[PDB]
Amino acid sequence: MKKLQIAVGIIRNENNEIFITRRAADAHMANKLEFPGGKIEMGETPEQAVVRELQEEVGITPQHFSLFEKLEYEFPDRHITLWFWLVERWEGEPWGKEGQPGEWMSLVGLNADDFPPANEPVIAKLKRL
Ligand SMILES: Nc1nc2c([nH]c(=O)n2[C@H]2C[C@H](O)[C@@H](COP(=O)(O)OP(=O)(O)OP(=O)(O)O)O2)c(=O)[nH]1
Ligand SMILES: [Mn+2]
Ligand SMILES: [Mn+2]
Ligand SMILES: [Mn+2]
């Protein structure tokens, strides 16, 4: 099947809230909550991809971020490797730059069932921080 490398950014403010967007109804993992991110392209690194994806999707440039978790997940029709970057400093103010819903969500209130199932261990690990 299809095999993808995906970089996403966990955007955390100083109030323990995360900037979360919601995927379109016609997308893979439709209507799910998500960390902004996307496919790592040929000729770019995982670090470059999370910067580019956050610039495109929510209008911020991550800086001094760290790899929170890397994991693989087998969906029904595709295999992806997810790079979860913890982003605690950035230039700009995140918004729905691609017209998608986005809002700040308390970390304690996140419900893993609202996200793709691949995110389950990451959401749990974030809550222990
Ligand atoms: N963005 C994001 N994707 C996730 C998460 N968890 C998860 O399993 N995924 C999966 C859903 C998709 O199969 C894939 C992300 O690809 P995408 O749909 O964001 O692709 P993209 O933004 O590059 O799309 P495009 O603008 O290039 O057309 O990873 C997450 O927290 N954030
Ligand atoms: Mn993309
Ligand atoms: Mn995306
Ligand atoms: Mn994108």
mmCIF file of N, CA and C in Angstrom, residues 8-127:
data_model
loop_
_atom_site.group_PDB
_atom_site.id
_atom_site.type_symbol
_atom_site.label_atom_id
_atom_site.label_comp_id
_atom_site.label_asym_id
_atom_site.label_seq_id
_atom_site.Cartn_x
_atom_site.Cartn_y
_atom_site.Cartn_z
ATOM 1 N N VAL A 8 4.162 16.451 12.220
ATOM 2 C CA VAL A 8 3.126 17.279 12.818
ATOM 3 C C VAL A 8 3.699 18.033 14.010
ATOM 4 N N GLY A 9 3.058 19.161 14.319
ATOM 5 C CA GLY A 9 3.490 20.014 15.409
ATOM 6 C C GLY A 9 2.485 20.102 16.539
ATOM 7 N N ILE A 10 2.942 19.775 17.745
ATOM 8 C CA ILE A 10 2.155 19.920 18.964
ATOM 9 C C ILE A 10 2.473 21.316 19.479
ATOM 10 N N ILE A 11 1.550 22.249 19.263
ATOM 11 C CA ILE A 11 1.772 23.667 19.516
ATOM 12 C C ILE A 11 1.201 23.987 20.888
ATOM 13 N N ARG A 12 2.066 24.172 21.886
ATOM 14 C CA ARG A 12 1.647 24.336 23.277
ATOM 15 C C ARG A 12 1.966 25.744 23.778
ATOM 16 N N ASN A 13 0.961 26.440 24.308
ATOM 17 C CA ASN A 13 1.207 27.780 24.821
ATOM 18 C C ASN A 13 1.569 27.707 26.306
ATOM 19 N N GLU A 14 1.756 28.863 26.936
ATOM 20 C CA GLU A 14 2.194 28.838 28.327
ATOM 21 C C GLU A 14 1.068 28.505 29.297
ATOM 22 N N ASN A 15 -0.166 28.357 28.813
ATOM 23 C CA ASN A 15 -1.306 27.995 29.647
ATOM 24 C C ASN A 15 -1.688 26.528 29.509
ATOM 25 N N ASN A 16 -0.772 25.687 29.027
ATOM 26 C CA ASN A 16 -1.011 24.253 28.880
ATOM 27 C C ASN A 16 -2.157 23.968 27.907
ATOM 28 N N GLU A 17 -2.293 24.794 26.874
ATOM 29 C CA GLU A 17 -3.292 24.602 25.833
ATOM 30 C C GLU A 17 -2.576 24.292 24.525
ATOM 31 N N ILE A 18 -3.235 23.515 23.668
ATOM 32 C CA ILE A 18 -2.653 23.063 22.408
ATOM 33 C C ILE A 18 -3.491 23.612 21.266
ATOM 34 N N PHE A 19 -2.828 24.075 20.203
ATOM 35 C CA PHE A 19 -3.560 24.582 19.047
ATOM 36 C C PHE A 19 -3.919 23.415 18.138
ATOM 37 N N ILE A 20 -5.214 23.122 18.049
ATOM 38 C CA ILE A 20 -5.734 21.930 17.387
ATOM 39 C C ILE A 20 -6.633 22.361 16.234
ATOM 40 N N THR A 21 -6.460 21.730 15.069
ATOM 41 C CA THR A 21 -7.330 21.954 13.922
ATOM 42 C C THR A 21 -8.205 20.725 13.684
ATOM 43 N N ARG A 22 -9.221 20.880 12.835
ATOM 44 C CA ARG A 22 -10.112 19.768 12.512
ATOM 45 C C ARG A 22 -10.058 19.484 11.018
ATOM 46 N N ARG A 23 -9.857 18.209 10.675
ATOM 47 C CA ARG A 23 -9.673 17.792 9.291
ATOM 48 C C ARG A 23 -10.977 17.872 8.503
ATOM 49 N N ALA A 24 -10.846 18.163 7.208
ATOM 50 C CA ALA A 24 -11.998 18.318 6.331
ATOM 51 C C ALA A 24 -12.799 17.023 6.235
ATOM 52 N N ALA A 25 -14.063 17.160 5.828
ATOM 53 C CA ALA A 25 -14.954 16.008 5.790
ATOM 54 C C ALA A 25 -14.597 15.021 4.685
ATOM 55 N N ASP A 26 -13.838 15.447 3.677
ATOM 56 C CA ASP A 26 -13.470 14.576 2.565
ATOM 57 C C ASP A 26 -12.015 14.123 2.624
ATOM 58 N N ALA A 27 -11.342 14.349 3.738
ATOM 59 C CA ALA A 27 -9.942 13.979 3.871
ATOM 60 C C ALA A 27 -9.828 12.595 4.488
ATOM 61 N N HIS A 28 -8.650 11.987 4.339
ATOM 62 C CA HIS A 28 -8.340 10.846 5.187
ATOM 63 C C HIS A 28 -8.480 11.289 6.635
ATOM 64 N N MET A 29 -8.963 10.389 7.491
ATOM 65 C CA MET A 29 -9.275 10.736 8.878
ATOM 66 C C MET A 29 -10.177 11.971 8.923
ATOM 67 N N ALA A 30 -11.254 11.904 8.144
ATOM 68 C CA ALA A 30 -12.163 13.032 7.997
ATOM 69 C C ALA A 30 -12.769 13.423 9.338
ATOM 70 N N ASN A 31 -12.927 14.733 9.545
ATOM 71 C CA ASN A 31 -13.587 15.338 10.701
ATOM 72 C C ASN A 31 -12.842 15.130 12.011
ATOM 73 N N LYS A 32 -11.653 14.535 11.985
ATOM 74 C CA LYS A 32 -10.912 14.287 13.215
ATOM 75 C C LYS A 32 -10.128 15.521 13.644
ATOM 76 N N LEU A 33 -9.969 15.674 14.956
ATOM 77 C CA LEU A 33 -9.039 16.669 15.473
ATOM 78 C C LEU A 33 -7.610 16.227 15.174
ATOM 79 N N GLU A 34 -6.694 17.191 15.094
ATOM 80 C CA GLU A 34 -5.366 16.856 14.597
ATOM 81 C C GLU A 34 -4.362 17.889 15.081
ATOM 82 N N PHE A 35 -3.103 17.462 15.184
ATOM 83 C CA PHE A 35 -2.002 18.422 15.226
ATOM 84 C C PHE A 35 -1.705 18.872 13.800
ATOM 85 N N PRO A 36 -1.515 20.166 13.541
ATOM 86 C CA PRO A 36 -1.197 20.586 12.166
ATOM 87 C C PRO A 36 0.056 19.876 11.668
ATOM 88 N N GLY A 37 0.049 19.502 10.394
ATOM 89 C CA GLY A 37 1.209 18.844 9.817
ATOM 90 C C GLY A 37 0.868 18.224 8.475
ATOM 91 N N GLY A 38 1.826 17.476 7.940
ATOM 92 C CA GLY A 38 1.620 16.884 6.633
ATOM 93 C C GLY A 38 2.840 16.117 6.172
ATOM 94 N N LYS A 39 2.809 15.757 4.892
ATOM 95 C CA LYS A 39 3.788 14.829 4.335
ATOM 96 C C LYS A 39 5.171 15.468 4.239
ATOM 97 N N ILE A 40 6.194 14.719 4.655
ATOM 98 C CA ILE A 40 7.587 15.110 4.448
ATOM 99 C C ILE A 40 7.931 14.861 2.987
ATOM 100 N N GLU A 41 8.323 15.914 2.282
ATOM 101 C CA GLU A 41 8.528 15.832 0.846
ATOM 102 C C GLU A 41 9.950 15.392 0.518
ATOM 103 N N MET A 42 10.122 14.890 -0.702
ATOM 104 C CA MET A 42 11.446 14.485 -1.144
ATOM 105 C C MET A 42 12.380 15.685 -1.074
ATOM 106 N N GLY A 43 13.586 15.453 -0.573
ATOM 107 C CA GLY A 43 14.569 16.515 -0.476
ATOM 108 C C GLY A 43 14.403 17.445 0.706
ATOM 109 N N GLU A 44 13.457 17.182 1.607
ATOM 110 C CA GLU A 44 13.361 17.951 2.837
ATOM 111 C C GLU A 44 13.411 17.001 4.026
ATOM 112 N N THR A 45 13.892 17.519 5.157
ATOM 113 C CA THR A 45 14.062 16.746 6.384
ATOM 114 C C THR A 45 12.794 16.785 7.218
ATOM 115 N N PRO A 46 12.670 15.890 8.218
ATOM 116 C CA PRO A 46 11.509 15.977 9.121
ATOM 117 C C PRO A 46 11.404 17.320 9.826
ATOM 118 N N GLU A 47 12.545 17.923 10.192
ATOM 119 C CA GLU A 47 12.526 19.227 10.844
ATOM 120 C C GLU A 47 12.081 20.318 9.879
ATOM 121 N N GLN A 48 12.567 20.271 8.636
ATOM 122 C CA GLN A 48 12.118 21.244 7.649
ATOM 123 C C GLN A 48 10.637 21.065 7.336
ATOM 124 N N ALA A 49 10.158 19.821 7.323
ATOM 125 C CA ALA A 49 8.756 19.592 6.980
ATOM 126 C C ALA A 49 7.812 20.143 8.048
ATOM 127 N N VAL A 50 8.150 19.998 9.330
ATOM 128 C CA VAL A 50 7.209 20.487 10.336
ATOM 129 C C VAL A 50 7.159 22.008 10.298
ATOM 130 N N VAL A 51 8.290 22.658 10.006
ATOM 131 C CA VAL A 51 8.310 24.115 9.859
ATOM 132 C C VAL A 51 7.452 24.546 8.677
ATOM 133 N N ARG A 52 7.668 23.934 7.512
ATOM 134 C CA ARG A 52 6.885 24.291 6.330
ATOM 135 C C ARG A 52 5.400 24.020 6.540
ATOM 136 N N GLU A 53 5.057 22.849 7.090
ATOM 137 C CA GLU A 53 3.642 22.525 7.264
ATOM 138 C C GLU A 53 2.958 23.497 8.220
ATOM 139 N N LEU A 54 3.631 23.882 9.304
ATOM 140 C CA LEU A 54 2.993 24.824 10.223
ATOM 141 C C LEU A 54 2.892 26.216 9.608
ATOM 142 N N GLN A 55 3.881 26.611 8.810
ATOM 143 C CA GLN A 55 3.762 27.872 8.083
ATOM 144 C C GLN A 55 2.557 27.850 7.145
ATOM 145 N N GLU A 56 2.385 26.751 6.396
ATOM 146 C CA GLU A 56 1.278 26.662 5.440
ATOM 147 C C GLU A 56 -0.068 26.564 6.149
ATOM 148 N N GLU A 57 -0.158 25.710 7.168
ATOM 149 C CA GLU A 57 -1.479 25.389 7.698
ATOM 150 C C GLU A 57 -1.961 26.409 8.721
ATOM 151 N N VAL A 58 -1.076 26.950 9.563
ATOM 152 C CA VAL A 58 -1.510 27.812 10.658
ATOM 153 C C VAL A 58 -0.701 29.096 10.775
ATOM 154 N N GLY A 59 0.266 29.337 9.892
ATOM 155 C CA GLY A 59 0.895 30.647 9.827
ATOM 156 C C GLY A 59 1.906 30.948 10.909
ATOM 157 N N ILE A 60 2.557 29.928 11.467
ATOM 158 C CA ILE A 60 3.614 30.149 12.444
ATOM 159 C C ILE A 60 4.871 29.426 11.986
ATOM 160 N N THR A 61 6.010 29.948 12.416
ATOM 161 C CA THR A 61 7.296 29.286 12.204
ATOM 162 C C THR A 61 7.755 28.687 13.523
ATOM 163 N N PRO A 62 7.766 27.368 13.667
ATOM 164 C CA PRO A 62 8.256 26.767 14.912
ATOM 165 C C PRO A 62 9.737 27.027 15.080
ATOM 166 N N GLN A 63 10.159 27.211 16.326
ATOM 167 C CA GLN A 63 11.583 27.316 16.601
ATOM 168 C C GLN A 63 11.930 26.593 17.896
ATOM 169 N N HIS A 64 13.138 26.030 17.925
ATOM 170 C CA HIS A 64 13.654 25.323 19.096
ATOM 171 C C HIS A 64 12.662 24.266 19.586
ATOM 172 N N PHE A 65 12.176 23.466 18.651
ATOM 173 C CA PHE A 65 11.222 22.404 18.935
ATOM 174 C C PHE A 65 11.977 21.095 19.120
ATOM 175 N N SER A 66 11.277 20.071 19.609
ATOM 176 C CA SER A 66 11.921 18.796 19.912
ATOM 177 C C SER A 66 11.043 17.653 19.432
ATOM 178 N N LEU A 67 11.662 16.496 19.167
ATOM 179 C CA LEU A 67 10.890 15.318 18.769
ATOM 180 C C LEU A 67 10.262 14.704 20.013
ATOM 181 N N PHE A 68 8.944 14.824 20.127
ATOM 182 C CA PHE A 68 8.240 14.293 21.282
ATOM 183 C C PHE A 68 8.042 12.790 21.149
ATOM 184 N N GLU A 69 7.690 12.336 19.954
ATOM 185 C CA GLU A 69 7.418 10.930 19.720
ATOM 186 C C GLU A 69 7.507 10.667 18.226
ATOM 187 N N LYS A 70 8.012 9.491 17.865
ATOM 188 C CA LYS A 70 7.939 9.000 16.500
ATOM 189 C C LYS A 70 7.348 7.605 16.550
ATOM 190 N N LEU A 71 6.350 7.350 15.709
ATOM 191 C CA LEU A 71 5.695 6.050 15.735
ATOM 192 C C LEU A 71 5.167 5.715 14.352
ATOM 193 N N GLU A 72 4.863 4.439 14.160
ATOM 194 C CA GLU A 72 4.284 3.959 12.919
ATOM 195 C C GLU A 72 2.857 3.504 13.183
ATOM 196 N N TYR A 73 1.989 3.685 12.194
ATOM 197 C CA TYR A 73 0.606 3.251 12.351
ATOM 198 C C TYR A 73 0.097 2.688 11.037
ATOM 199 N N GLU A 74 -0.560 1.533 11.105
ATOM 200 C CA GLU A 74 -1.164 0.911 9.931
ATOM 201 C C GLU A 74 -2.654 1.255 9.909
ATOM 202 N N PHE A 75 -3.032 2.156 9.011
ATOM 203 C CA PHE A 75 -4.430 2.435 8.725
ATOM 204 C C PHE A 75 -4.973 1.375 7.774
ATOM 205 N N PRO A 76 -6.296 1.319 7.599
ATOM 206 C CA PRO A 76 -6.871 0.318 6.685
ATOM 207 C C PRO A 76 -6.289 0.333 5.279
ATOM 208 N N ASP A 77 -5.900 1.497 4.740
ATOM 209 C CA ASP A 77 -5.441 1.558 3.359
ATOM 210 C C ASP A 77 -4.086 2.234 3.197
ATOM 211 N N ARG A 78 -3.355 2.479 4.281
ATOM 212 C CA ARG A 78 -2.069 3.154 4.159
ATOM 213 C C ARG A 78 -1.270 2.955 5.441
ATOM 214 N N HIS A 79 0.050 2.988 5.300
ATOM 215 C CA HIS A 79 0.964 2.918 6.428
ATOM 216 C C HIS A 79 1.671 4.260 6.546
ATOM 217 N N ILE A 80 1.654 4.857 7.737
ATOM 218 C CA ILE A 80 2.349 6.128 7.906
ATOM 219 C C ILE A 80 3.276 6.065 9.110
ATOM 220 N N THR A 81 4.379 6.790 9.001
ATOM 221 C CA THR A 81 5.259 7.074 10.122
ATOM 222 C C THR A 81 5.013 8.524 10.513
ATOM 223 N N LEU A 82 4.674 8.748 11.783
ATOM 224 C CA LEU A 82 4.320 10.062 12.302
ATOM 225 C C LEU A 82 5.449 10.596 13.164
ATOM 226 N N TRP A 83 5.880 11.814 12.871
ATOM 227 C CA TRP A 83 6.890 12.512 13.653
ATOM 228 C C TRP A 83 6.173 13.594 14.450
ATOM 229 N N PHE A 84 6.051 13.403 15.767
ATOM 230 C CA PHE A 84 5.348 14.361 16.623
ATOM 231 C C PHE A 84 6.370 15.304 17.243
ATOM 232 N N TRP A 85 6.387 16.552 16.776
ATOM 233 C CA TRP A 85 7.287 17.572 17.299
ATOM 234 C C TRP A 85 6.569 18.427 18.338
ATOM 235 N N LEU A 86 7.192 18.583 19.501
ATOM 236 C CA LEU A 86 6.680 19.472 20.541
ATOM 237 C C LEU A 86 7.191 20.885 20.270
ATOM 238 N N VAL A 87 6.268 21.816 20.033
ATOM 239 C CA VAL A 87 6.575 23.172 19.598
ATOM 240 C C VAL A 87 6.106 24.116 20.693
ATOM 241 N N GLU A 88 7.051 24.682 21.438
ATOM 242 C CA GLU A 88 6.722 25.543 22.564
ATOM 243 C C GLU A 88 7.122 26.991 22.344
ATOM 244 N N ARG A 89 7.843 27.277 21.271
ATOM 245 C CA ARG A 89 8.232 28.625 20.908
ATOM 246 C C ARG A 89 7.988 28.780 19.417
ATOM 247 N N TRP A 90 7.423 29.915 19.010
ATOM 248 C CA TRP A 90 7.206 30.109 17.583
ATOM 249 C C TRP A 90 7.094 31.589 17.282
ATOM 250 N N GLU A 91 7.297 31.913 16.011
ATOM 251 C CA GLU A 91 7.005 33.242 15.501
ATOM 252 C C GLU A 91 5.600 33.214 14.918
ATOM 253 N N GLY A 92 4.786 34.193 15.287
ATOM 254 C CA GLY A 92 3.455 34.339 14.737
ATOM 255 C C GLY A 92 2.383 33.893 15.715
ATOM 256 N N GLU A 93 1.151 33.937 15.216
ATOM 257 C CA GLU A 93 -0.042 33.611 15.986
ATOM 258 C C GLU A 93 -0.808 32.575 15.176
ATOM 259 N N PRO A 94 -0.991 31.348 15.672
ATOM 260 C CA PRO A 94 -1.635 30.326 14.836
ATOM 261 C C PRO A 94 -3.094 30.657 14.574
ATOM 262 N N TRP A 95 -3.530 30.370 13.346
ATOM 263 C CA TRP A 95 -4.902 30.603 12.925
ATOM 264 C C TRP A 95 -5.254 29.605 11.834
ATOM 265 N N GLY A 96 -6.520 29.620 11.420
ATOM 266 C CA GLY A 96 -6.964 28.709 10.379
ATOM 267 C C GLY A 96 -6.587 29.229 9.012
ATOM 268 N N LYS A 97 -5.287 29.180 8.709
ATOM 269 C CA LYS A 97 -4.761 29.864 7.535
ATOM 270 C C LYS A 97 -5.243 29.230 6.235
ATOM 271 N N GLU A 98 -5.604 27.947 6.261
ATOM 272 C CA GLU A 98 -6.189 27.264 5.112
ATOM 273 C C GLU A 98 -7.705 27.185 5.206
ATOM 274 N N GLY A 99 -8.321 28.053 6.003
ATOM 275 C CA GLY A 99 -9.759 28.064 6.162
ATOM 276 C C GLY A 99 -10.304 26.963 7.036
ATOM 277 N N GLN A 100 -9.430 26.189 7.699
ATOM 278 C CA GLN A 100 -9.861 25.068 8.517
ATOM 279 C C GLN A 100 -10.151 25.538 9.942
ATOM 280 N N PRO A 101 -11.005 24.830 10.686
ATOM 281 C CA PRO A 101 -11.234 25.206 12.086
ATOM 282 C C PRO A 101 -9.966 24.986 12.887
ATOM 283 N N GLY A 102 -9.671 25.922 13.778
ATOM 284 C CA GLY A 102 -8.541 25.768 14.665
ATOM 285 C C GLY A 102 -8.834 26.470 15.970
ATOM 286 N N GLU A 103 -8.465 25.868 17.094
ATOM 287 C CA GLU A 103 -8.629 26.572 18.360
ATOM 288 C C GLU A 103 -7.697 25.988 19.409
ATOM 289 N N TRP A 104 -7.522 26.758 20.478
ATOM 290 C CA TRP A 104 -6.732 26.327 21.617
ATOM 291 C C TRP A 104 -7.564 25.389 22.481
ATOM 292 N N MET A 105 -6.964 24.275 22.883
ATOM 293 C CA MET A 105 -7.647 23.247 23.654
ATOM 294 C C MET A 105 -6.792 22.901 24.858
ATOM 295 N N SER A 106 -7.389 22.875 26.054
ATOM 296 C CA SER A 106 -6.607 22.487 27.228
ATOM 297 C C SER A 106 -6.060 21.083 27.031
ATOM 298 N N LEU A 107 -4.803 20.886 27.429
ATOM 299 C CA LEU A 107 -4.214 19.553 27.347
ATOM 300 C C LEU A 107 -5.016 18.544 28.163
ATOM 301 N N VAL A 108 -5.453 18.932 29.363
ATOM 302 C CA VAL A 108 -6.139 17.961 30.216
ATOM 303 C C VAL A 108 -7.458 17.531 29.599
ATOM 304 N N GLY A 109 -8.069 18.386 28.793
ATOM 305 C CA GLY A 109 -9.357 18.082 28.217
ATOM 306 C C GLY A 109 -9.341 17.328 26.911
ATOM 307 N N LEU A 110 -8.172 17.060 26.327
ATOM 308 C CA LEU A 110 -8.131 16.339 25.061
ATOM 309 C C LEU A 110 -8.683 14.926 25.217
ATOM 310 N N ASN A 111 -9.464 14.506 24.229
ATOM 311 C CA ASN A 111 -10.075 13.186 24.189
ATOM 312 C C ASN A 111 -9.471 12.453 22.996
ATOM 313 N N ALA A 112 -8.680 11.411 23.269
ATOM 314 C CA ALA A 112 -7.985 10.724 22.184
ATOM 315 C C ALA A 112 -8.954 10.202 21.130
ATOM 316 N N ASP A 113 -10.202 9.917 21.518
ATOM 317 C CA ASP A 113 -11.170 9.411 20.554
ATOM 318 C C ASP A 113 -11.489 10.429 19.464
ATOM 319 N N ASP A 114 -11.255 11.722 19.723
ATOM 320 C CA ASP A 114 -11.492 12.778 18.736
ATOM 321 C C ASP A 114 -10.414 12.852 17.660
ATOM 322 N N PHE A 115 -9.282 12.194 17.859
ATOM 323 C CA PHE A 115 -8.100 12.254 17.008
ATOM 324 C C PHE A 115 -7.945 10.949 16.235
ATOM 325 N N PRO A 116 -7.103 10.917 15.204
ATOM 326 C CA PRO A 116 -6.796 9.638 14.576
ATOM 327 C C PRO A 116 -6.253 8.676 15.611
ATOM 328 N N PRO A 117 -6.538 7.382 15.470
ATOM 329 C CA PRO A 117 -6.111 6.427 16.502
ATOM 330 C C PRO A 117 -4.614 6.361 16.669
ATOM 331 N N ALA A 118 -3.855 6.743 15.643
ATOM 332 C CA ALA A 118 -2.407 6.765 15.767
ATOM 333 C C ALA A 118 -1.943 7.701 16.876
ATOM 334 N N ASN A 119 -2.720 8.750 17.185
ATOM 335 C CA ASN A 119 -2.324 9.730 18.193
ATOM 336 C C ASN A 119 -2.523 9.262 19.633
ATOM 337 N N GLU A 120 -3.158 8.113 19.858
ATOM 338 C CA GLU A 120 -3.511 7.725 21.224
ATOM 339 C C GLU A 120 -2.328 7.747 22.190
ATOM 340 N N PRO A 121 -1.188 7.095 21.914
ATOM 341 C CA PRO A 121 -0.091 7.132 22.901
ATOM 342 C C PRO A 121 0.501 8.516 23.091
ATOM 343 N N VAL A 122 0.470 9.355 22.055
ATOM 344 C CA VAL A 122 1.018 10.703 22.168
ATOM 345 C C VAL A 122 0.155 11.565 23.079
ATOM 346 N N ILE A 123 -1.165 11.475 22.930
ATOM 347 C CA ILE A 123 -2.057 12.256 23.779
ATOM 348 C C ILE A 123 -1.906 11.832 25.231
ATOM 349 N N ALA A 124 -1.790 10.522 25.471
ATOM 350 C CA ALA A 124 -1.584 10.030 26.829
ATOM 351 C C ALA A 124 -0.276 10.553 27.406
ATOM 352 N N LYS A 125 0.794 10.494 26.617
ATOM 353 C CA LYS A 125 2.095 10.924 27.106
ATOM 354 C C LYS A 125 2.118 12.424 27.351
ATOM 355 N N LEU A 126 1.398 13.196 26.532
ATOM 356 C CA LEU A 126 1.325 14.637 26.756
ATOM 357 C C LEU A 126 0.671 14.950 28.091
ATOM 358 N N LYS A 127 -0.354 14.177 28.460
ATOM 359 C CA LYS A 127 -1.072 14.433 29.702
ATOM 360 C C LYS A 127 -0.230 14.145 30.937
#
